[PDB]
Amino acid sequence: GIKESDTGLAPPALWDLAADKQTL
Amino acid sequence: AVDTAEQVYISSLALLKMLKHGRAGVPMEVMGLMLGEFVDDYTVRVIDVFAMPQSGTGVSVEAVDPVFQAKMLDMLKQTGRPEMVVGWYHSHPGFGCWLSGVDINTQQSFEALSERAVAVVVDPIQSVKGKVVIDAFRLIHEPRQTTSNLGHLNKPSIQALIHGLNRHYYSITINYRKNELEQKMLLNLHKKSWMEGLTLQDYSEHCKHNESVVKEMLELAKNYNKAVEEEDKMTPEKQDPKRHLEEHVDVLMTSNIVQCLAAMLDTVVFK
Amino acid sequence: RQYYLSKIEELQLIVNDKSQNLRRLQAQRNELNAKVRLLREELQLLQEQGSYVGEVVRAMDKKKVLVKVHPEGKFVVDVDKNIDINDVTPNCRVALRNDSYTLHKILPNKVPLVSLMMVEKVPDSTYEMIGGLDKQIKEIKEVIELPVKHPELFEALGIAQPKGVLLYGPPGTGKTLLARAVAHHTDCTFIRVSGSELVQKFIGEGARMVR
Amino acid sequence: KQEEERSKVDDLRGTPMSVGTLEEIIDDNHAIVSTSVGSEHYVSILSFVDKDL
Amino acid sequence: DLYSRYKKLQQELEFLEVQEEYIKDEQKNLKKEFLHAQEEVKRIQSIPLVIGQFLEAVDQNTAIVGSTTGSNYYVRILSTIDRELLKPNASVALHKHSNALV
Numbered sequence A: 001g002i003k004e005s006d007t008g009l010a011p012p013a014l015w016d017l018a019a020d021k022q023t024l
Numbered sequence B: 001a002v003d004t005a006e007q008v009y010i011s012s013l014a015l016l017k018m019l020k021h022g023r024a025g026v027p028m029e030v031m032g033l034m035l036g037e038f039v040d041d042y043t044v045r046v047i048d049v050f051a052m053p054q055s056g057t058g059v060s061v062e063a064v065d066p067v068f069q070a071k072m073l074d075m076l077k078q079t080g081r082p083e084m085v086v087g088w089y090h091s092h093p094g095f096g097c098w099l100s101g102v103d104i105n106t107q108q109s110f111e112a113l114s115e116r117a118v119a120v121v122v123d124p125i126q127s128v129k130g131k132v133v134i135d136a137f138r139l140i141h142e143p144r145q146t147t148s149n150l151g152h153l154n155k156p157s158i159q160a161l162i163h164g165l166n167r168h169y170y171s172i173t174i175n176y177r178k179n180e181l182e183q184k185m186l187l188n189l190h191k192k193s194w195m196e197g198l199t200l201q202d203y204s205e206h207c208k209h210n211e212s213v214v215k216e217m218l219e220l221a222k223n224y225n226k227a228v229e230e231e232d233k234m235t236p237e238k239q240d241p242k243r244h245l246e247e248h249v250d251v252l253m254t255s256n257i258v259q260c261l262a263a264m265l266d267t268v269v270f271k
Numbered sequence C: 001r002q003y004y005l006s007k008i009e010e011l012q013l014i015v016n017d018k019s020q021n022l023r024r025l026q027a028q029r030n031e032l033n034a035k036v037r038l039l040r041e042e043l044q045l046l047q048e049q050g051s052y053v054g055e056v057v058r059a060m061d062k063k064k065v066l067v068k069v070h071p072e073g074k075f076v077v078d079v080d081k082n083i084d085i086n087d088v089t090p091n092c093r094v095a096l097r098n099d100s101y102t103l104h105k106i107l108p109n110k111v112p113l114v115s116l117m118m119v120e121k122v123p124d125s126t127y128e129m130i131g132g133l134d135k136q137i138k139e140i141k142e143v144i145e146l147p148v149k150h151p152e153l154f155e156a157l158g159i160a161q162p163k164g165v166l167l168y169g170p171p172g173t174g175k176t177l178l179a180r181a182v183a184h185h186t187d188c189t190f191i192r193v194s195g196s197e198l199v200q201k202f203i204g205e206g207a208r209m210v211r
Numbered sequence D: 001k002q003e004e005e006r007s008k009v010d011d012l013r014g015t016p017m018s019v020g021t022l023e024e025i026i027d028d029n030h031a032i033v034s035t036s037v038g039s040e041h042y043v044s045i046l047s048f049v050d051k052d053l
Numbered sequence E: 001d002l003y004s005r006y007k008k009l010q011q012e013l014e015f016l017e018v019q020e021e022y023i024k025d026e027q028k029n030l031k032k033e034f035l036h037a038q039e040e041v042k043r044i045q046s047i048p049l050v051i052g053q054f055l056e057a058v059d060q061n062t063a064i065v066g067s068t069t070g071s072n073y074y075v076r077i078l079s080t081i082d083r084e085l086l087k088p089n090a091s092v093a094l095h096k097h098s099n100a101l102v
């Protein structure tokens, strides 16, 4: 399998919705 | 039918204002409006173009002075131009035909204006030396394509695709409304006059031109004695003697024969 | 008799000669047609842009390569449809796409300015033109001619190979001459750097020219 | 799997990705960051990022 | 039987005459198109060109070059640029926008 290179990111239940897209 | 790959026609008379305005405002995204007609669902033609002076806001809806345009349309329709405004254009010096955040909002008003207004982008500084960079765009999957016309065109360029159909807007293929009258009129700009075609250049300068190649022919003659001496059938490298002999021969002969021919004709005409 | 059997001899010669004369002109036209196709695609390929240069450092994910560009810093970059990402070793140096970054290809064997220090033509200097320094020649060979020829001897002593050589002393005594003569005989790739070529100007010109 | 997220947040991280260095976390949703050219930028924070820098 | 071959002779004489008749027209047309293309390629290397430093030859037609703007670019070589003049120390001129080596 491929190895992660210290990229972060939280689980799905903790981000996005339309809020982030509208803000950006 | 809900509009498709479609087509846009621009008059040559409209085109030259597109470039002259662009090359006038080399520091700024100068803008203006087009008069034309949504003649049918398959194409739109534009005839005549008027640029309009600077607004400190740059490209925007408020860049349009309602007083100026209304009287400009009023003056134009009086002098025989009753066409409505079918689209707006602005310059993008230094970058290709694509729509920025201000442009998409600016165009979005224009579709909100009547039904299907179209924008035009000109990049007058890279549109140079015979190269032209113009394209038309409209906002909203483009409706059902029924002809390979847009399949013929190059797909949206990367510098425009980075801001391309992900912004749900698309290109419309440019086309030109030039006619036989305009074609020969523009051709007559550079068409040679009789005394111009009968000019004998300069005999001393002709010798300078003759030496400028004959001296080179001495080297390529030596160099021709290199290509023929490496006949071992090695890897391909046309260069040095082979080609450059033939182009220089072409220009040299046509220079001498025409100069002598015109002088010979001059010898016959004038006595 | 001599109409069906006469035309297919007296005029068949003409039609075959015409076929061959047409064949030579067909080849001549095909040359110019391939040439004009070449020139057209030449113009069209003269319409994209250089897309600068970058270096891969990690394939953090498929379609998401970490790269480091020449003037600026580091970015996440995807690759063209060839997308042979696992072929891409870090520090390979690669060619990108112009905008949205993205990657075009892998480029050939890496080094460009750094290539300039490698000695193309070895000097004529030869050990036979150095007098007396034979002992120093052996003391340089033990760190040059011996290890590149006999790592087995180092293993048979079990010791680590020497790392480098410092030629010091008075100016004008042969260290330059010995270096030039060594370039003539080591037959391994010889690269040379003036001490003042380094550090130089703009940040990284010290980093890049050593790394 | 997360193909819905792959269809949303991968698009939010529209390629390419620039790399810089943070210096201030003044807002829980806006930080202030530096980059290669040495410029400084007050920028927004998207919620999927780690709360650590 | 022998009638058919004479008829084929009659067909092929005129067919090949047609062939040559438009092959010469095609020769002239392709000469015109070639000259148009080459005047375009010469127009490429006209005058408003940036200066850079030739770094290395990626392929027979493309190379890495180092611009005086500071950035280095993966750049097409102009075919007429005759190769032996090139060395990693050869100062070169590039098209302003495509950055192509001209």
Ligand SMILES: Nc1ncnc2c1ncn2[C@@H]1O[C@H](COP(=O)(O)OP(=O)(O)OP(=O)(O)O)[C@@H](O)[C@H]1O
Residues within 6 Å of the ligand: C129, C130, C131, C132, C133, C170, C171, C172, C173, C174, C175, C176, C177, C178
């Ligand atoms: N043993 C030697 N045999 C022959 N020539 C020598 C010998 N030692 C020095 N030379 C000559 O000395 C000249 C000066 O260069 P040399 O290599 O001696 O300088 P150097 O010790 O590197 O000092 P610098 O740093 O001042 O250049 C050379 O032309 C070289 O031929």
Ligand SMILES: [Mg+2]
Residues within 6 Å of the ligand: C172, C175, C176
């Ligand atoms: Mg020395």
Ligand SMILES: [Zn+2]
Residues within 6 Å of the ligand: B029, B059, B090, B092, B099, B100, B102, B103
């Ligand atoms: Zn704009």
